[PDB]
Amino acid sequence: GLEKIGTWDPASGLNMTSLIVTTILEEPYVLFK
């Protein structure tokens, strides 16, 4: 039936109700040291 679903009021509007760096192994950008 008719149920309240939230309020309205003029101020409040309508109030309803270490970094893991993954990479690839690829020379020469990232090779295994």
Curated annotation (Swiss-Prot):
Q: How is it modified after translation?
A: Sumoylation mediates kainate receptor-mediated endocytosis and regulates synaptic transmission. Sumoylation is enhanced by PIAS3 and desumoylated by SENP1. Ubiquitinated. Ubiquitination regulates the GRIK2 levels at the synapse by leading kainate receptor degradation through proteasome.
Q: In which tissues is it expressed?
A: Highest expression is found in the olfactory lobe, piriform cortex, dentate gyrus, hippocampus, granular cell layer of the cerebellum, and in caudate-putamen.
Compartments it resides in: Cell membrane; Postsynaptic cell membrane
Glycosylated where?
A: 15
Any further remarks?
The postsynaptic actions of Glu are mediated by a variety of receptors that are named according to their selective agonists. This receptor binds domoate > kainate > quisqualate > glutamate. It does not bind AMPA without coexpression with GRIK5.
What's this chain's function?
Ionotropic glutamate receptor that functions as a cation-permeable ligand-gated ion channel, gated by L-glutamate and the glutamatergic agonist kainic acid. L-glutamate acts as an excitatory neurotransmitter at many synapses in the central nervous system. Binding of the excitatory neurotransmitter L-glutamate induces a conformation change, leading to the opening of the cation channel, and thereby converts the chemical signal to an electrical impulse. The receptor then desensitizes rapidly and enters a transient inactive state, characterized by the presence of bound agonist. Independent of its ionotropic glutamate receptor activity, acts as a thermoreceptor conferring sensitivity to cold temperatures. Functions in dorsal root ganglion neurons.
Regarding protein family, the annotation reads:
Belongs to the glutamate-gated ion channel (TC 1.A.10.1) family. GRIK2 subfamily.
Instruction: Fill in the subunit field for this protein.
Output: Homotetramer and heterotetramer with GRIK5. Tetramers may be formed by the dimerization of dimers. Assembles into a kainate-gated homomeric channel that does not bind AMPA. Can form functional heteromeric receptors with GRIK4 and GRIK5. Can form functional heteromeric receptors with GRIK3. Interacts with DLG4. Interacts with NETO2. Interacts (via C-terminus) with KLHL17 (via kelch repeats); the interaction targets GRIK2 for degradation via ubiquitin-proteasome pathway.
- What's the protein here called? Glutamate receptor ionotropic, kainate 2
List the source organism: Rattus norvegicus (Rat)
Q: What is the lineage of its organism?
A: Eukaryota, Metazoa, Chordata, Craniata, Vertebrata
Stretch of the intact protein here: 398 to 447 of 908
